[PDB]
Design a protein around this ligand. Structure first.
Ligand SMILES: Nc1ncnc2c1ncn2[C@@H]1O[C@H](COP(=O)(O)OP(=O)(O)OP(O)(O)=S)[C@@H](O)[C@H]1O
Ligand SMILES: Nc1ncnc2c1ncn2[C@@H]1O[C@H](COP(=O)(O)OP(=O)(O)OP(O)(O)=S)[C@@H](O)[C@H]1O
Ligand SMILES: Nc1ncnc2c1ncn2[C@@H]1O[C@H](COP(=O)(O)OP(=O)(O)OP(O)(O)=S)[C@@H](O)[C@H]1O
Ligand SMILES: Nc1ncnc2c1ncn2[C@@H]1O[C@H](COP(=O)(O)OP(=O)(O)OP(O)(O)=S)[C@@H](O)[C@H]1O
Ligand SMILES: [Mg+2]
Ligand SMILES: [Mg+2]
Ligand SMILES: [Mg+2]
Ligand SMILES: [Mg+2]
Lengths: 581, 25, 374
């Protein structure tokens, strides 16, 4: 039977059993159940990482140490291995013989407790084809009689889904609910376990670092429970010092190391930003201004919001920024957002809201509920943010979508979290939400029926109020109205488009020269305040690209050669010099 | 418009079978 | 154990595993996790083709080279085969005996790090109708203790849909997020792998060709990740050069071959238009005018837009051309489009908008959302 079970008491005496700090009330209840006349089989139901195994194994540590009640003294705790019992039970009845023989040892001792971790497994065991006899059925008579005591550990999902189904077995096991410890309780646990981790890595952990790990992990990590979650940062932190060369520096683990570990585990920007990041961040606005002209107010909001988050003054639970870029057509509402991610080197989560025009389309974002065809697919929005927590969420043409879809973003803007169909909670704390809208374009295009025109810009603001409920608008950091492109900015736009044309020509070996007079002519011919920058490409396409494309395929431009574009004042028509060479 | 009809996805239980040997003598 | 698992370290010496280029940051956190006191089982979650198996298999290859840390040195990685473990396990206990034997071997070694690719499968390993005894349940006591180290590789969909549901197993495994590398990083990977591909195909890829494959595949090829995308154009290009020019097969693989391969994979016109295609473009306007008389402006807009796209001056992220043909009945608004497809030999995707007269019909074009009929 020694092969099947491990003596925890003996194990703790020589190497260690990960001692338990605290949990006095939990242990007291378990000891009380063990002392019961009948059904003295305590069960430990709790979430993953709460410390169920530590409590059962910790009991052995306390017994050897002697800090336990007299009734529980001189008690042996054995950890059963389900695999060992079933490893060689090929023949009929072999499993029953081993299981029954092992149980007899416990009855004879009368002071022995069995620890079956992952007790849900015993429910199904030793059933070759149709056999209903199993460890649960074989052990059931003994549990009711109270001859033997068996500690159990199971998760809430495993308990309810499988263990609870067995009503008879559940009756014998007195459920003990383990609840996640507090922040103060966790630091005490780490302090007790600190010598073991320090000896393993030959490192040391400052008191500030221990407190920082618990607090920082709670804020940025929300997929694991506090005891393991804090211990995960402390363990990996020590490895970093060990991994780094001993020659340069290996003294201790400070708060700075803890922040780096949490940042990588959570895939969030590391605190105490490096000089390289700061240089990029300070010049982010200038770079954006080069790409987009006349939208400095929009750029200022995005760059300032990102700066606050890295500086440590960001919202505790809300996203980095909720910006509604409402403006006329072709004013750079999405160019800045598309170029912001490129400058920051983060993934761009671009979602077109025209697809989400129906109320039933909400399932695409959060996934289908359980028991449906699309439950496996999940939510496109939750999956995207989970994979790329630090990213830019661009909801283009949000106004086109159904009003119901806007309600989903309320929790995202306020709590920075969206629950998927499965129940996983996404994090939007580091996501730069940008909802571009074109509401009011028709109102501005409309002309007032009066002797004097009206300021239709204010009319679009009221339309925004009708489309979006006040709660949605209140959550938004600020609504940035993009002004119509002026004549001066249009000249810069033409240069930007010409530069893009040069890149295409550079691949083919062609170099394009455009006189200043020619650039102004193109701008004047295609300058439309309502349409914006987009018609500039049309004039450039028809005037510059169209002649160049005939020659490239059927002329001198086939082989890369420089070309000069000049304006003829006599005819007011652009003159193209192919210069075959 | 028109009403939206949802369709469920039936899931059938599937299992395997183990074997137990017995030496003749 | 030898039958079920394969020693990746041995394969590296004989060249079985390909060289690992870069991925230092991904590997740096992998050794830190493996050095942890408890739950030292790094997991590699990433999209298909990112290089998850390359990093796990590459670690064994890096150990042979000797550029890994001292801790990693003297360690041997074993690739577990789920099929072999569950092969001929009809009798009760064969799976447990084989799995327990493997765990005992790893614990005894104290330096061997297992590598279970597609780790989602162990959650659904051998079990009875109501049996809950699986490899995940059996391995859990050892993973938490830290006696054995197990590397894992599974996709994002599999991790969330299957691995995440088993919270106990997920807790033991420390997820390491792998993302597709940059363009500059991908070319380095191809250069490192270029000798193996060149030897098999007996071709030599030029520096321009390698760079072209990475840049051209990112733009034209979609739904595939960058490492796989570029490698597919390199491997496929080598095969074409080997078999097509039967007589004096071209040793070099110029940029032109790379463009042709990308066109076939993406089913789009190849760059560097050929002479035959050129004649069609100049005569397109004349051909269309003969079939459809009058309406010269319409033909000029369609033909000029196509010329610019083939010439390489087309919009980077917009269609070739968006045109609204508004006119009286019977003026050939649809004939100019039907004939254009025939002239260019491309499929005519004719979608009648009369059917989509209501908002509910939008679901037909883009599909019904998850959880609804259709
Ligand atoms: N009160 C405690 N004192 C000491 N260590 C604790 C305590 N609570 C939890 N732990 C730690 O918890 C780990 C072992 O138990 P957990 O993994 O938290 O729970 P568990 O019930 O074994 O988890 P599963 O296997 O996922 S159901 C070790 O890192 C312990 O040190
Ligand atoms: N201020 C600007 N500077 C440079 N390019 C601009 C500017 N405003 C618009 N563009 C051009 O706009 C094109 C992309 O359209 P966007 O500006 O993103 O449209 P938008 O403002 O979101 O309007 P809608 O929503 O598409 S009607 C690119 O060709 C940009 O170069
Ligand atoms: N860093 C790298 N160095 C060298 N080759 C690499 C690297 N990353 C990926 N590759 C190669 O890219 C191809 C695909 O990568 P793999 O790691 O084999 O993919 P995978 O993780 O098995 O993909 P699945 O099965 O779709 S999840 C192989 O040829 C790899 O060798
Ligand atoms: N401009 C034209 N030149 C030659 N034949 C023409 C022309 N316009 C129409 N036809 C003839 O008329 C047939 C039908 O024309 P349609 O393609 O139905 O015209 P349409 O104006 O596009 O129609 P709608 O879309 O229903 S208003 C063609 O297949 C030709 O036989
Ligand atoms: Mg446990
Ligand atoms: Mg836009
Ligand atoms: Mg793989
Ligand atoms: Mg018609």
């Amino acid at each position: 039977t020694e092969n099947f079970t491990t003596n925890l008491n003996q194990l703790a005496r020589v190497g260690g059993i990960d001692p338990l700090i605290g949990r006095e009330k939990e242990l007291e209840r378990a000891i009380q159940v063990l002392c019961r006349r009948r059904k003295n089989n305590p069960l430990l139901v709790g979430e993953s990482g709460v410390g169920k195994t530590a409590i059962a194994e910790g009991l052995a540590w306390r017994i050897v140490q002697g800090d336990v009640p007299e009734v529980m003294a001189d008690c042996t705790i054995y950890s059963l291995d389900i695999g060992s019992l079933l490893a060689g039970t090929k023949y009929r009845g072999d499993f029953e013989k081993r299981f029954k023989a092992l149980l007899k040892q416990l009855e004879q001792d009368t002071n022995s407790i069995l620890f079956i971790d992952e007790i849900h497994t015993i429910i199904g065991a030793g059933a070759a084809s149709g056999g209903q006899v199993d460890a649960a059925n074989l052990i059931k008579p003994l549990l009711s009689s109270g001859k033997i005591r068996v500690i159990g550990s199971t998760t809430y999902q495993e308990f309810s889904n499988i263990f609870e189904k067995d009503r008879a077995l559940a009756r014998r096991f007195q459920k003990i609910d383990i609840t996640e410890p507090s922040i103060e309780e966790t630091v005490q646990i780490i302090n007790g376990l600190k010598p073991k981790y320090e000896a393993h890595h030959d490192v040391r952990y400052t008191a500030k670092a221990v407190r920082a790990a618990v607090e920082l992990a709670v804020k940025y990590i929300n997929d694991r429970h506090l005891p393991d979650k804090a211990i995960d940062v402390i363990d990996e932190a020590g490895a970093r010092a060990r991994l780094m060369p001993v020659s340069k520096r290996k003294k201790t683990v400070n708060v700075a190391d803890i922040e780096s570990v949490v940042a990588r585990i959570a895939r969030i920007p590391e605190k105490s930003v490096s000089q390289s990041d700061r240089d990029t961040l300070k010049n982010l606005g200038d770079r954006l201004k080069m790409l987009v002209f006349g939208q400095d107010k929009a750029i200022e909001a995005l760059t300032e919001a990102i700066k606050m988050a890295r500086a440590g003054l960001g919202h505790e639970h809300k996203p980095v920024g909720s910006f509604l870029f409402a403006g006329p057509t072709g004013v750079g509402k999405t160019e800045v957002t598309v170029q912001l991610s490129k400058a920051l080197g983060i993934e761009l989560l671009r979602f077109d809201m025209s697809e989400y025009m129906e109320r039933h389309t909400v399932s695409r974002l959060i996934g289908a509920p359980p028991g449906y065809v699309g439950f496996d697919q999940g939510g496109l929005l939750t999956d995207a943010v989970i994979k790329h927590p630090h990213a830019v969420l661009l909801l283009d043409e949000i106004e086109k979508a159904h009003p119901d879809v806007f309600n989903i973003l309320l929790q995202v803007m306020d709590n920075g979290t969206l629950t998927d169909n499965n129940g996983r909670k996404a994090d939007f704390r580091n996501v730069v939400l940008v909802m571009t809208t074109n509401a009011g374009v028709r109102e501005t295009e409309r002309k007032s029926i009066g002797l004097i025109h009206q300021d239709n810009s204010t009319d679009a603001m009221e339309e925004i109020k009708k489309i979006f409920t006040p709660e949605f608008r209140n959550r938004l950091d600020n609504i940035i109205w993009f002004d119509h492109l002026s004549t001066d900015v249009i000249h810069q736009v033409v240069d930007k488009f010409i530069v893009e044309l040069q890149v295409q020509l550079d691949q083919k070996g062609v170099s394009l020269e455009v006189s200043q007079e020619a650039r102004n002519w193109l701008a004047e011919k295609g300058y439309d305040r309502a349409m914006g920058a987009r018609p500039m490409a049309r004039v450039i396409q028809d005037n510059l690209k169209k002649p160049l494309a005939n020659e490239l395929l059927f002329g001198s431009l086939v082989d890369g050669g420089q070309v000069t574009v000049a304006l003829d004042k006599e005819k007011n028509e652009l003159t193209y010099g192919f210069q075959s060479a | 418009g028109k009403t939206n009809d949802w369709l469920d996805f039936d899931q059938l239980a599937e299992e395997k079978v183990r074997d137990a040997l017995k030496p003749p003598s």
